[PDB]
């Protein structure tokens, strides 16, 4: 309807892209939530994996909130969609979950880069800076950490070695 009194240099496409990204961040939150409680099962029982993915879940929820804040700051209107359940109910092993987290973070990062591209094409430097400042380096760090974790788990003998996942749990995530 009529324009927001605050809206300036904020393209409708960018508004819609921010609504999509909000959904994605909430989806990531939900994936990490599912992973966490997988490690809390009595037949998995890797409680530092569980803590680690729980913390990641809460961070994703903050990423979503900051985008919702941003939408309103710029005078867009938030439109929420269903948060899809994760692909998996069973995440298999410590290694497998880390690998899927890595794929998830690379996908979120690709979405954030597309979003930056759009912002760039619509000459929205405030939005460019927002993405750069609060999102892009956060993704690079998260991706590098996950790569590091996957590498160690593999080198240690995961997923075959239940010993390896147990010791990684204690020494890296603990």
Question: Does residue 42 belong to the site contacting Cl ion (CB under 5 A)?
Answer: no
Asked if residue 66 binds a copy of itself (CB under 8 A), the reply is no
Q: How far is the CB of 130 from Mg ion (least distance, A)?
A: 8
With tokens 């003998």, the residue in question is: 157
Of 54-83, binders to Mg ion (CB under 5 A) are: 56, 59-60, 63
DSSP of 46-58: -HHHHHHHHHHHH
163 near a copy of itself (CB under 8 A): yes
Site for Cl ion in 44-63 (CB under 5 A): none
Q: Which two tokens stand for residue 131?
A: 């993405």
* By the rule CB under 8 A, 116 interacts with a copy of itself: yes
**Token pair of 150, please?**
């996957």
CB of 28 to a copy of itself, least distance (A): 13
**Positions of E strands within 13-63:** none
**Nearest residue to 103 (alpha-carbon basis) of 139, 50, 62:** 139
Q: Are 77 and 11 in contact (CB under 8 A)?
A: no
37 touches a copy of itself by CB under 8 A = yes
Q: How many of the other CB atoms lie within 10 Å of CB of 173?
A: 18
Residue nearest to Mg ion (CB): 63
Q: Which residues bind Cl ion (CB under 5 A)?
A: 7, 10-12, 81-82
- Binding positions for Fe cation: 25, 60, 63, 105, 139
- Binding positions: 25, 60, 63, 105, 139
């Amino acid at each position: 309807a009529s324009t927001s009194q605050v809206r300036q240099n904020y393209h409708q496409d960018s508004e819609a892209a921010i609504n999509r990204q909000i959904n994605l961040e909430l989806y990531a939150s939900y994936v990490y939530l599912s992973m966490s409680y997988y490690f809390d099962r009595d037949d998995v029982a890797l409680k530092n994996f569980a803590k680690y993915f729980l913390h990641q879940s809460h961070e994703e929820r903050e990423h979503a909130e900051k985008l919702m804040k941003l939408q309103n700051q710029r005078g867009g209107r938030i439109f929420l969609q269903d948060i899809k359940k994760p692909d998996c109910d069973d995440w298999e092993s410590g290694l497998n979950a880390m690998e899927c987290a890595l794929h998830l973070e690379k996908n979120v990062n690709q979405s954030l880069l597309e979003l930056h591209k759009l912002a760039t094409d619509k000459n929205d430097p405030h939005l460019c800076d927002f993405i750069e400042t609060h999102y892009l380096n956060e993704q690079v760090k998260a991706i590098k950490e996950l790569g590091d974790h996957v590498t160690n788990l593999r080198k240690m003998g995961a997923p075959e070695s239940g010993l390896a996942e147990y010791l990684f749990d204690k020494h890296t995530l603990g």
